[PDB]
Amino acid sequence: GAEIYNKDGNKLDLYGKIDGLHYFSDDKSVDGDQTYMRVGVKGETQINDQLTGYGQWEYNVQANNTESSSDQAWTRLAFAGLKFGDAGSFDYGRNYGVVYDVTSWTDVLPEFGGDGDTYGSDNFLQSRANGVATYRNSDFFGLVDGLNFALQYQGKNGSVSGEGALSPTNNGRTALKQNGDGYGTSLTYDIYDGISAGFAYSNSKRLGDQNSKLALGRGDNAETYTGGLKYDANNIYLATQYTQTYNATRAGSLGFANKAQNFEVVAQYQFDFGLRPSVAYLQSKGKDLEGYGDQDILKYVDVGATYYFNKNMSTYVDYKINLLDDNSFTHNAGISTDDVVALGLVYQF
Amino acid sequence: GAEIYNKDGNKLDLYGKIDGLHYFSDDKSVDGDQTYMRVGVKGETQINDQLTGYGQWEYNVQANNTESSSDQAWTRLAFAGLKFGDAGSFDYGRNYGVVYDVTSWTDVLPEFGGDGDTYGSDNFLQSRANGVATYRNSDFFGLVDGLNFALQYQGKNGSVSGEGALSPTNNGRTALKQNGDGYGTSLTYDIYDGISAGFAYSNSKRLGDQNSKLALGRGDNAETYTGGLKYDANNIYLATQYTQTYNATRAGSLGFANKAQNFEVVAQYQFDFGLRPSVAYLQSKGKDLEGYGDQDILKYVDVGATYYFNKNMSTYVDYKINLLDDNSFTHNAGISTDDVVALGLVYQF
Amino acid sequence: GAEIYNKDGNKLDLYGKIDGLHYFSDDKSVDGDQTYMRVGVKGETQINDQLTGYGQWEYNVQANNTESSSDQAWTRLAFAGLKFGDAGSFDYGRNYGVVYDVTSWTDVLPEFGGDGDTYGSDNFLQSRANGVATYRNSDFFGLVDGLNFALQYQGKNGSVSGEGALSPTNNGRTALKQNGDGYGTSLTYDIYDGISAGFAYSNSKRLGDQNSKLALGRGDNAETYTGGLKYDANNIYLATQYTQTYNATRAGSLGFANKAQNFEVVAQYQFDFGLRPSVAYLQSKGKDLEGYGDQDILKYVDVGATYYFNKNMSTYVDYKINLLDDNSFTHNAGISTDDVVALGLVYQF
């Protein structure tokens, strides 16, 4: 979104945004200033005619807290790879999971949706994850036009290394964000004009900690079946996804859901003067939970609008109307049941 | 200011500095290497004839500690807003308080003065603060030429969220850096040529934590009345500020002063070969302290010089001559009474 | 490696890399994803005919862990200084020690070698260190053509300031990363064409903490004698270093070695299609250890290759074959005795 360097086959696109955001909620753990900013580089070098190396980095820096505070910045994306002209591409690092190739069609809300809802960050291959080799391929080895296919492999990421251990690595992490040797695949196709369909499947080994430290979720493998449909035409965005996860959807902080049925659907209209009203519904029903029965993990209706000044400046307002009923599951799992109203003005370069 | 991008009405300025700095002092909590660097972007996009969107970000990175060290970087500024041609501007994020619109006239020392002295970072609206909606207006609605006035509103920033609570928010902070819903206004005018006067007023509700956890300072509202006069002409810089704060000036680490009288005054001369000697006096007399009574919170005379090679490179040396007498107040408040000698060489892009 | 701004005597180079890296090892404290990225600026300003100011900054950002993790970024380099055209240069900040001016000729391995092996970060003047004033001089005061000489002084960097103290500073650090008032000098000369020789000497005071808290290493001064020989021509790189350190080489985590003999030797061939196989041997034999005696601190054989697509993209594989025998010294010092295999694809801008 801003190419600051272009010389001798090297281009360096420097992109990002400064989002001044504020939340209103009864939940005083999200209430207050939420002003953040993202910044990153997006460079590539040309090697020959049908070979181009590239790298990307996306850094997230929070700016709603004081300078006395700690751990206020992290790396969202960081990978490097090669482009084989048309035969596809290959990249490795911290990148989006292949399941996202479908789920991203509903991550189009003014502020909400996406991470922290039906899926989350470091949740196997459902979003951003560490050490993922992703082979993407445009137009299925040239065979089928418009058929974008992808394969992904993820390395084992266990607990913090030390005495006690149990499948440790150098990048040891919290119990809910671990993952074993996993793989995944995505597949998107434009069936008609403006209409697209997609499918994604992921399977990762689970570690001992995810069957021990937390109470919810027991099983050897974590699987995700994902399907999506997107209509983007006539100033209409209308998308829906659906995911059946097995030992893979987070149940707050208690563990994982042995069986989960995520479902997102969003509708937006784009005006000619720059107003984009958006209405969505997200739900995630968890089945066969250890202890509890069949419970709702997430359920809310979104409504809001985004006013676009131009390709760089915008402002937005969002309303999460939480439909979750307070029961014994949300009390100990720590799942919020309160409505939230977001209000933001973001500059974007 | 090194403008690295300018294309199609969008500009991206990239500014900052790398200050290699060293302190000499009896206070062994500031003596030693102090090498820091700041870096940030200053971009803007043009929307229409009388509307321009902009954003700013300023990042501070310390470089005096080892690679093992923690919490060595923070965000000084990060906001986004709109400039209405002549009718003014409106911005939201982490920005400078309106009181700084005046007191900054004495934050012109080779290294000392300004933040961390009479006021500090996140000290209500006296300096940098989180979540401030600032409506500035150049030339008083076109009515009065040269009268720059500003209005500011600040959202509630409480304690860490959890059990116990007491007015919490998501950006919860230490008791001395909290603030409730506050407002403020500034007013600066160049009466003659080179002579300027200024006024600033801030009023924020104080939170329960600031009347409980720390001992000094009790009250419901925190107010700051500030006035300043600056003469900048004929190679003469001569400025003075003065602030009466009520439940707003930090008394080191003990709390706030129920009544405080901050006063800074600085005089500098600019030579033709790039040498700028500077002499200042900063004091902060605290009145009505719980226990201690009437004590001095800060009191020192500054003397030093800055040699400017050009508009980008410079070097400086400073001498803080602390006039504070050692008593029980400085012992419990953690207020330093020792002289400091700064010595720096700064590259600036 | 990418000059984004160059106008009116000011140039602003923007360099760095995005290294997607993965380790395989029995030692499950280094195994797993290691994807890191470095990014920094390399600017300079022109002052007059024989005076040019410059500044440099190098930031290391880890991206192998989750966003929940802490302390994943640090500053490798950050300094500012003046270039006297040809008469030399002077810079201060966090910069490379003068001993590296020699040892860097063997830190040319595909991934391993350098920091964390025979020397380390913040290990007196053997690598990067805080608060170093470095006066370099190109072509020895005009006397001798081609003779690069350097002098460096380092300020005292002790423990964290507080009650108890014992030589404290504001940038207080871990016991093994401390350093007193030190100095050093390096001297490199190209004797033949492609053949170079170099010598370096450093002497720093040790603090009370390094003779008290840890058991190994006793003495008042820490000294390093370093010598190096480099042959770089005819697609042949062949270099060797040798260092006798006294109270200066780390003996893992037990303290310092009263006598250490570091020795590195590397041989590489550069093909015409971009393959650079490299074979090296690094060892560090420690003599006169408190309690143990004569032990091996480091000893392994390196073998690997770096395939260069071009000057920006590359991929590599490395093999650290550890020759260390398991004994009580490696048991208490925490020194790894396991083989490691690195595998990386790095974009470089």
Side-chain angles (χ1 to χ4, degrees), chain C residues 100 102-109 112-114 118-119 228-230 237-242 263-266 268 280 282:
Chain C
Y100 197 57
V102 178
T103 69
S104 59
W105 296 345
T106 55
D107 191 0
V108 297
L109 295 184
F112 302 149
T118 56
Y119 47 89
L229 260 63
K230 176 184 69 179
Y237 198 161
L238 185 51
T240 172
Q241 160 216 6
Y242 181 92
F263 167 39
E264 307 182 357
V265 47
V266 57
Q268 312 175 343
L282 298 79

PDB file of all heavy atoms in Angstrom, chain C residues 100 102-109 112-114 118-119 228-230 237-242 263-266 268 280 282:
ATOM      1  N   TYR C 100      35.770  -8.051  17.939  1.00  0.00           N
ATOM      2  CA  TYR C 100      35.038  -8.611  16.814  1.00  0.00           C
ATOM      3  C   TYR C 100      35.688  -8.237  15.491  1.00  0.00           C
ATOM      4  O   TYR C 100      35.677  -9.051  14.560  1.00  0.00           O
ATOM      5  CB  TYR C 100      33.584  -8.134  16.838  1.00  0.00           C
ATOM      6  CG  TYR C 100      32.656  -8.954  15.968  1.00  0.00           C
ATOM      7  CD1 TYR C 100      32.525 -10.321  16.148  1.00  0.00           C
ATOM      8  CD2 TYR C 100      31.927  -8.355  14.946  1.00  0.00           C
ATOM      9  CE1 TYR C 100      31.683 -11.070  15.347  1.00  0.00           C
ATOM     10  CE2 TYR C 100      31.082  -9.095  14.142  1.00  0.00           C
ATOM     11  CZ  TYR C 100      30.965 -10.450  14.345  1.00  0.00           C
ATOM     12  OH  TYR C 100      30.125 -11.191  13.545  1.00  0.00           O
ATOM     13  N   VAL C 102      38.394  -8.679  14.518  1.00  0.00           N
ATOM     14  CA  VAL C 102      39.147  -9.834  14.085  1.00  0.00           C
ATOM     15  C   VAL C 102      38.255 -11.068  14.022  1.00  0.00           C
ATOM     16  O   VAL C 102      38.149 -11.722  12.982  1.00  0.00           O
ATOM     17  CB  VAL C 102      40.356 -10.056  15.022  1.00  0.00           C
ATOM     18  CG1 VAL C 102      41.125 -11.292  14.608  1.00  0.00           C
ATOM     19  CG2 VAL C 102      41.244  -8.829  15.039  1.00  0.00           C
ATOM     20  N   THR C 103      37.527 -11.342  15.110  1.00  0.00           N
ATOM     21  CA  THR C 103      36.780 -12.591  15.228  1.00  0.00           C
ATOM     22  C   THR C 103      35.688 -12.712  14.175  1.00  0.00           C
ATOM     23  O   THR C 103      35.243 -13.827  13.888  1.00  0.00           O
ATOM     24  CB  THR C 103      36.173 -12.719  16.625  1.00  0.00           C
ATOM     25  OG1 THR C 103      35.135 -11.751  16.789  1.00  0.00           O
ATOM     26  CG2 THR C 103      37.247 -12.466  17.665  1.00  0.00           C
ATOM     27  N   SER C 104      35.247 -11.596  13.592  1.00  0.00           N
ATOM     28  CA  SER C 104      34.217 -11.657  12.563  1.00  0.00           C
ATOM     29  C   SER C 104      34.678 -12.409  11.322  1.00  0.00           C
ATOM     30  O   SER C 104      33.837 -12.837  10.521  1.00  0.00           O
ATOM     31  CB  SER C 104      33.786 -10.247  12.176  1.00  0.00           C
ATOM     32  OG  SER C 104      34.892  -9.506  11.690  1.00  0.00           O
ATOM     33  N   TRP C 105      35.989 -12.577  11.132  1.00  0.00           N
ATOM     34  CA  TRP C 105      36.445 -13.293   9.946  1.00  0.00           C
ATOM     35  C   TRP C 105      36.113 -14.779   9.992  1.00  0.00           C
ATOM     36  O   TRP C 105      36.140 -15.437   8.946  1.00  0.00           O
ATOM     37  CB  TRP C 105      37.944 -13.088   9.741  1.00  0.00           C
ATOM     38  CG  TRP C 105      38.292 -11.663   9.472  1.00  0.00           C
ATOM     39  CD1 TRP C 105      37.432 -10.659   9.128  1.00  0.00           C
ATOM     40  CD2 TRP C 105      39.593 -11.074   9.530  1.00  0.00           C
ATOM     41  NE1 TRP C 105      38.119  -9.482   8.967  1.00  0.00           N
ATOM     42  CE2 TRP C 105      39.448  -9.710   9.208  1.00  0.00           C
ATOM     43  CE3 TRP C 105      40.866 -11.568   9.823  1.00  0.00           C
ATOM     44  CZ2 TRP C 105      40.530  -8.836   9.171  1.00  0.00           C
ATOM     45  CZ3 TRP C 105      41.938 -10.699   9.786  1.00  0.00           C
ATOM     46  CH2 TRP C 105      41.764  -9.348   9.461  1.00  0.00           C
ATOM     47  N   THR C 106      35.796 -15.323  11.169  1.00  0.00           N
ATOM     48  CA  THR C 106      35.368 -16.710  11.291  1.00  0.00           C
ATOM     49  C   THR C 106      33.890 -16.847  11.626  1.00  0.00           C
ATOM     50  O   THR C 106      33.385 -17.974  11.686  1.00  0.00           O
ATOM     51  CB  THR C 106      36.204 -17.435  12.355  1.00  0.00           C
ATOM     52  OG1 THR C 106      36.144 -16.713  13.588  1.00  0.00           O
ATOM     53  CG2 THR C 106      37.655 -17.542  11.906  1.00  0.00           C
ATOM     54  N   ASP C 107      33.187 -15.739  11.851  1.00  0.00           N
ATOM     55  CA  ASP C 107      31.740 -15.767  12.051  1.00  0.00           C
ATOM     56  C   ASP C 107      31.037 -15.681  10.695  1.00  0.00           C
ATOM     57  O   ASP C 107      30.231 -14.793  10.421  1.00  0.00           O
ATOM     58  CB  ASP C 107      31.310 -14.638  12.982  1.00  0.00           C
ATOM     59  CG  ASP C 107      29.866 -14.773  13.436  1.00  0.00           C
ATOM     60  OD1 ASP C 107      29.193 -15.741  13.020  1.00  0.00           O
ATOM     61  OD2 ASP C 107      29.403 -13.910  14.213  1.00  0.00           O
ATOM     62  N   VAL C 108      31.368 -16.644   9.840  1.00  0.00           N
ATOM     63  CA  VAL C 108      30.918 -16.645   8.454  1.00  0.00           C
ATOM     64  C   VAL C 108      30.254 -17.980   8.161  1.00  0.00           C
ATOM     65  O   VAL C 108      30.123 -18.384   7.001  1.00  0.00           O
ATOM     66  CB  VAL C 108      32.089 -16.384   7.490  1.00  0.00           C
ATOM     67  CG1 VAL C 108      32.677 -15.001   7.732  1.00  0.00           C
ATOM     68  CG2 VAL C 108      33.157 -17.453   7.659  1.00  0.00           C
ATOM     69  N   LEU C 109      29.830 -18.668   9.215  1.00  0.00           N
ATOM     70  CA  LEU C 109      29.205 -19.964   9.058  1.00  0.00           C
ATOM     71  C   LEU C 109      27.793 -19.802   8.504  1.00  0.00           C
ATOM     72  O   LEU C 109      27.202 -18.723   8.593  1.00  0.00           O
ATOM     73  CB  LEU C 109      29.182 -20.700  10.395  1.00  0.00           C
ATOM     74  CG  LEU C 109      30.587 -21.034  10.889  1.00  0.00           C
ATOM     75  CD1 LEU C 109      30.554 -21.854  12.169  1.00  0.00           C
ATOM     76  CD2 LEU C 109      31.339 -21.756   9.791  1.00  0.00           C
ATOM     77  N   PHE C 112      25.688 -21.051  12.338  1.00  0.00           N
ATOM     78  CA  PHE C 112      26.269 -21.181  13.665  1.00  0.00           C
ATOM     79  C   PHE C 112      27.495 -20.275  13.787  1.00  0.00           C
ATOM     80  O   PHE C 112      27.694 -19.364  12.980  1.00  0.00           O
ATOM     81  CB  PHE C 112      26.576 -22.656  13.933  1.00  0.00           C
ATOM     82  CG  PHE C 112      25.372 -23.545  13.824  1.00  0.00           C
ATOM     83  CD1 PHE C 112      25.497 -24.860  13.409  1.00  0.00           C
ATOM     84  CD2 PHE C 112      24.108 -23.056  14.110  1.00  0.00           C
ATOM     85  CE1 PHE C 112      24.383 -25.673  13.300  1.00  0.00           C
ATOM     86  CE2 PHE C 112      22.995 -23.864  14.006  1.00  0.00           C
ATOM     87  CZ  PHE C 112      23.131 -25.174  13.602  1.00  0.00           C
ATOM     88  N   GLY C 113      28.322 -20.509  14.803  1.00  0.00           N
ATOM     89  CA  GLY C 113      29.484 -19.677  15.045  1.00  0.00           C
ATOM     90  C   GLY C 113      29.133 -18.311  15.599  1.00  0.00           C
ATOM     91  O   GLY C 113      27.959 -17.928  15.637  1.00  0.00           O
ATOM     92  N   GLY C 114      30.140 -17.568  16.037  1.00  0.00           N
ATOM     93  CA  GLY C 114      29.898 -16.215  16.510  1.00  0.00           C
ATOM     94  C   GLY C 114      29.353 -16.205  17.917  1.00  0.00           C
ATOM     95  O   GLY C 114      29.902 -16.848  18.816  1.00  0.00           O
ATOM     96  N   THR C 118      32.329 -19.363  21.095  1.00  0.00           N
ATOM     97  CA  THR C 118      33.577 -19.067  21.792  1.00  0.00           C
ATOM     98  C   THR C 118      33.459 -17.794  22.619  1.00  0.00           C
ATOM     99  O   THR C 118      33.996 -17.718  23.730  1.00  0.00           O
ATOM    100  CB  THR C 118      34.728 -18.957  20.790  1.00  0.00           C
ATOM    101  OG1 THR C 118      34.414 -17.965  19.803  1.00  0.00           O
ATOM    102  CG2 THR C 118      34.969 -20.295  20.108  1.00  0.00           C
ATOM    103  N   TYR C 119      32.761 -16.787  22.098  1.00  0.00           N
ATOM    104  CA  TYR C 119      32.431 -15.598  22.875  1.00  0.00           C
ATOM    105  C   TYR C 119      30.917 -15.480  22.989  1.00  0.00           C
ATOM    106  O   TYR C 119      30.202 -16.477  22.837  1.00  0.00           O
ATOM    107  CB  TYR C 119      33.024 -14.337  22.236  1.00  0.00           C
ATOM    108  CG  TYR C 119      32.799 -14.221  20.745  1.00  0.00           C
ATOM    109  CD1 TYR C 119      31.663 -13.597  20.243  1.00  0.00           C
ATOM    110  CD2 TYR C 119      33.721 -14.729  19.839  1.00  0.00           C
ATOM    111  CE1 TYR C 119      31.452 -13.483  18.881  1.00  0.00           C
ATOM    112  CE2 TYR C 119      33.517 -14.623  18.476  1.00  0.00           C
ATOM    113  CZ  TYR C 119      32.382 -13.999  18.002  1.00  0.00           C
ATOM    114  OH  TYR C 119      32.178 -13.892  16.645  1.00  0.00           O
ATOM    115  N   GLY C 228      43.947 -13.114  14.137  1.00  0.00           N
ATOM    116  CA  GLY C 228      43.169 -13.667  13.040  1.00  0.00           C
ATOM    117  C   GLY C 228      43.868 -13.535  11.706  1.00  0.00           C
ATOM    118  O   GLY C 228      44.606 -12.573  11.458  1.00  0.00           O
ATOM    119  N   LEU C 229      43.602 -14.503  10.828  1.00  0.00           N
ATOM    120  CA  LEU C 229      44.174 -14.573   9.489  1.00  0.00           C
ATOM    121  C   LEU C 229      43.067 -14.930   8.508  1.00  0.00           C
ATOM    122  O   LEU C 229      42.332 -15.898   8.729  1.00  0.00           O
ATOM    123  CB  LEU C 229      45.289 -15.623   9.423  1.00  0.00           C
ATOM    124  CG  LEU C 229      46.752 -15.188   9.495  1.00  0.00           C
ATOM    125  CD1 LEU C 229      47.065 -14.519  10.818  1.00  0.00           C
ATOM    126  CD2 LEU C 229      47.651 -16.391   9.280  1.00  0.00           C
ATOM    127  N   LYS C 230      42.948 -14.160   7.426  1.00  0.00           N
ATOM    128  CA  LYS C 230      41.860 -14.336   6.470  1.00  0.00           C
ATOM    129  C   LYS C 230      42.391 -14.352   5.043  1.00  0.00           C
ATOM    130  O   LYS C 230      43.106 -13.433   4.638  1.00  0.00           O
ATOM    131  CB  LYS C 230      40.811 -13.226   6.618  1.00  0.00           C
ATOM    132  CG  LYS C 230      39.691 -13.293   5.586  1.00  0.00           C
ATOM    133  CD  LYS C 230      38.723 -12.125   5.709  1.00  0.00           C
ATOM    134  CE  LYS C 230      39.361 -10.810   5.289  1.00  0.00           C
ATOM    135  NZ  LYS C 230      38.392  -9.683   5.381  1.00  0.00           N
ATOM    136  N   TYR C 237      37.352 -18.821   0.595  1.00  0.00           N
ATOM    137  CA  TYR C 237      37.397 -18.173   1.899  1.00  0.00           C
ATOM    138  C   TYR C 237      38.045 -19.138   2.881  1.00  0.00           C
ATOM    139  O   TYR C 237      37.617 -20.287   2.999  1.00  0.00           O
ATOM    140  CB  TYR C 237      35.996 -17.764   2.370  1.00  0.00           C
ATOM    141  CG  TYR C 237      35.964 -16.718   3.475  1.00  0.00           C
ATOM    142  CD1 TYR C 237      34.817 -15.973   3.718  1.00  0.00           C
ATOM    143  CD2 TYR C 237      37.080 -16.465   4.263  1.00  0.00           C
ATOM    144  CE1 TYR C 237      34.777 -15.018   4.721  1.00  0.00           C
ATOM    145  CE2 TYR C 237      37.049 -15.522   5.267  1.00  0.00           C
ATOM    146  CZ  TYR C 237      35.900 -14.798   5.492  1.00  0.00           C
ATOM    147  OH  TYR C 237      35.878 -13.850   6.492  1.00  0.00           O
ATOM    148  N   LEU C 238      39.077 -18.679   3.577  1.00  0.00           N
ATOM    149  CA  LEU C 238      39.809 -19.550   4.490  1.00  0.00           C
ATOM    150  C   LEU C 238      40.328 -18.682   5.624  1.00  0.00           C
ATOM    151  O   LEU C 238      41.248 -17.887   5.426  1.00  0.00           O
ATOM    152  CB  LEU C 238      40.942 -20.268   3.762  1.00  0.00           C
ATOM    153  CG  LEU C 238      41.749 -21.312   4.533  1.00  0.00           C
ATOM    154  CD1 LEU C 238      40.831 -22.317   5.199  1.00  0.00           C
ATOM    155  CD2 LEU C 238      42.708 -22.025   3.591  1.00  0.00           C
ATOM    156  N   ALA C 239      39.745 -18.835   6.807  1.00  0.00           N
ATOM    157  CA  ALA C 239      40.057 -17.937   7.906  1.00  0.00           C
ATOM    158  C   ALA C 239      40.286 -18.730   9.180  1.00  0.00           C
ATOM    159  O   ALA C 239      39.797 -19.851   9.339  1.00  0.00           O
ATOM    160  CB  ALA C 239      38.946 -16.905   8.121  1.00  0.00           C
ATOM    161  N   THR C 240      41.047 -18.129  10.088  1.00  0.00           N
ATOM    162  CA  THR C 240      41.321 -18.751  11.372  1.00  0.00           C
ATOM    163  C   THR C 240      41.553 -17.673  12.418  1.00  0.00           C
ATOM    164  O   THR C 240      42.181 -16.646  12.151  1.00  0.00           O
ATOM    165  CB  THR C 240      42.529 -19.697  11.299  1.00  0.00           C
ATOM    166  OG1 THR C 240      42.870 -20.130  12.620  1.00  0.00           O
ATOM    167  CG2 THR C 240      43.728 -19.007  10.665  1.00  0.00           C
ATOM    168  N   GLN C 241      41.028 -17.924  13.612  1.00  0.00           N
ATOM    169  CA  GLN C 241      41.153 -17.043  14.760  1.00  0.00           C
ATOM    170  C   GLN C 241      41.663 -17.840  15.953  1.00  0.00           C
ATOM    171  O   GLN C 241      41.420 -19.046  16.067  1.00  0.00           O
ATOM    172  CB  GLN C 241      39.776 -16.410  15.084  1.00  0.00           C
ATOM    173  CG  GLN C 241      39.607 -15.858  16.499  1.00  0.00           C
ATOM    174  CD  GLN C 241      38.207 -16.059  17.044  1.00  0.00           C
ATOM    175  OE1 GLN C 241      37.376 -16.710  16.417  1.00  0.00           O
ATOM    176  NE2 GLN C 241      37.956 -15.535  18.240  1.00  0.00           N
ATOM    177  N   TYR C 242      42.230 -17.109  16.910  1.00  0.00           N
ATOM    178  CA  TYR C 242      42.790 -17.697  18.118  1.00  0.00           C
ATOM    179  C   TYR C 242      42.825 -16.614  19.184  1.00  0.00           C
ATOM    180  O   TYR C 242      43.313 -15.508  18.934  1.00  0.00           O
ATOM    181  CB  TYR C 242      44.195 -18.255  17.883  1.00  0.00           C
ATOM    182  CG  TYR C 242      44.808 -18.906  19.104  1.00  0.00           C
ATOM    183  CD1 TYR C 242      44.658 -20.266  19.342  1.00  0.00           C
ATOM    184  CD2 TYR C 242      45.546 -18.161  20.015  1.00  0.00           C
ATOM    185  CE1 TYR C 242      45.221 -20.863  20.456  1.00  0.00           C
ATOM    186  CE2 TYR C 242      46.111 -18.748  21.131  1.00  0.00           C
ATOM    187  CZ  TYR C 242      45.947 -20.100  21.348  1.00  0.00           C
ATOM    188  OH  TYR C 242      46.510 -20.692  22.459  1.00  0.00           O
ATOM    189  N   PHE C 263      39.611 -20.985  19.619  1.00  0.00           N
ATOM    190  CA  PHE C 263      40.267 -21.265  18.347  1.00  0.00           C
ATOM    191  C   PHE C 263      39.192 -21.650  17.348  1.00  0.00           C
ATOM    192  O   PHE C 263      38.479 -22.640  17.551  1.00  0.00           O
ATOM    193  CB  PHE C 263      41.308 -22.379  18.520  1.00  0.00           C
ATOM    194  CG  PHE C 263      41.824 -22.958  17.232  1.00  0.00           C
ATOM    195  CD1 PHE C 263      42.066 -22.152  16.132  1.00  0.00           C
ATOM    196  CD2 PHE C 263      42.102 -24.311  17.139  1.00  0.00           C
ATOM    197  CE1 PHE C 263      42.543 -22.690  14.956  1.00  0.00           C
ATOM    198  CE2 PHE C 263      42.587 -24.853  15.971  1.00  0.00           C
ATOM    199  CZ  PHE C 263      42.806 -24.042  14.877  1.00  0.00           C
ATOM    200  N   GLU C 264      39.070 -20.869  16.277  1.00  0.00           N
ATOM    201  CA  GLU C 264      38.106 -21.159  15.225  1.00  0.00           C
ATOM    202  C   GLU C 264      38.822 -21.199  13.885  1.00  0.00           C
ATOM    203  O   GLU C 264      39.787 -20.465  13.668  1.00  0.00           O
ATOM    204  CB  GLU C 264      36.956 -20.127  15.183  1.00  0.00           C
ATOM    205  CG  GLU C 264      36.223 -19.912  16.511  1.00  0.00           C
ATOM    206  CD  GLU C 264      35.065 -18.924  16.392  1.00  0.00           C
ATOM    207  OE1 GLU C 264      34.870 -18.361  15.294  1.00  0.00           O
ATOM    208  OE2 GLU C 264      34.346 -18.710  17.392  1.00  0.00           O
ATOM    209  N   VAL C 265      38.372 -22.081  13.000  1.00  0.00           N
ATOM    210  CA  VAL C 265      38.955 -22.156  11.664  1.00  0.00           C
ATOM    211  C   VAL C 265      37.877 -22.597  10.685  1.00  0.00           C
ATOM    212  O   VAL C 265      37.152 -23.564  10.938  1.00  0.00           O
ATOM    213  CB  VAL C 265      40.183 -23.091  11.631  1.00  0.00           C
ATOM    214  CG1 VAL C 265      39.884 -24.403  12.337  1.00  0.00           C
ATOM    215  CG2 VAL C 265      40.621 -23.332  10.201  1.00  0.00           C
ATOM    216  N   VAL C 266      37.772 -21.886   9.565  1.00  0.00           N
ATOM    217  CA  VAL C 266      36.693 -22.092   8.607  1.00  0.00           C
ATOM    218  C   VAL C 266      37.263 -22.090   7.193  1.00  0.00           C
ATOM    219  O   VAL C 266      38.188 -21.331   6.877  1.00  0.00           O
ATOM    220  CB  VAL C 266      35.593 -21.016   8.769  1.00  0.00           C
ATOM    221  CG1 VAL C 266      36.175 -19.617   8.607  1.00  0.00           C
ATOM    222  CG2 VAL C 266      34.451 -21.250   7.791  1.00  0.00           C
ATOM    223  N   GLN C 268      35.690 -22.344   3.071  1.00  0.00           N
ATOM    224  CA  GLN C 268      34.510 -22.285   2.224  1.00  0.00           C
ATOM    225  C   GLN C 268      34.922 -22.119   0.772  1.00  0.00           C
ATOM    226  O   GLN C 268      35.908 -21.438   0.460  1.00  0.00           O
ATOM    227  CB  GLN C 268      33.597 -21.108   2.578  1.00  0.00           C
ATOM    228  CG  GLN C 268      33.289 -20.944   4.041  1.00  0.00           C
ATOM    229  CD  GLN C 268      32.487 -19.688   4.311  1.00  0.00           C
ATOM    230  OE1 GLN C 268      32.427 -18.787   3.473  1.00  0.00           O
ATOM    231  NE2 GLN C 268      31.858 -19.626   5.477  1.00  0.00           N
ATOM    232  N   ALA C 280      33.936 -25.937   9.273  1.00  0.00           N
ATOM    233  CA  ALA C 280      34.629 -25.198  10.312  1.00  0.00           C
ATOM    234  C   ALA C 280      34.823 -26.062  11.547  1.00  0.00           C
ATOM    235  O   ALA C 280      34.175 -27.094  11.730  1.00  0.00           O
ATOM    236  CB  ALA C 280      33.879 -23.919  10.696  1.00  0.00           C
ATOM    237  N   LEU C 282      35.378 -25.137  15.775  1.00  0.00           N
ATOM    238  CA  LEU C 282      35.422 -24.157  16.852  1.00  0.00           C
ATOM    239  C   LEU C 282      35.667 -24.893  18.159  1.00  0.00           C
ATOM    240  O   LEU C 282      35.005 -25.899  18.439  1.00  0.00           O
ATOM    241  CB  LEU C 282      34.117 -23.358  16.938  1.00  0.00           C
ATOM    242  CG  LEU C 282      33.669 -22.479  15.767  1.00  0.00           C
ATOM    243  CD1 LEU C 282      33.043 -23.298  14.651  1.00  0.00           C
ATOM    244  CD2 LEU C 282      32.691 -21.427  16.264  1.00  0.00           C
TER     245      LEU C 282
END
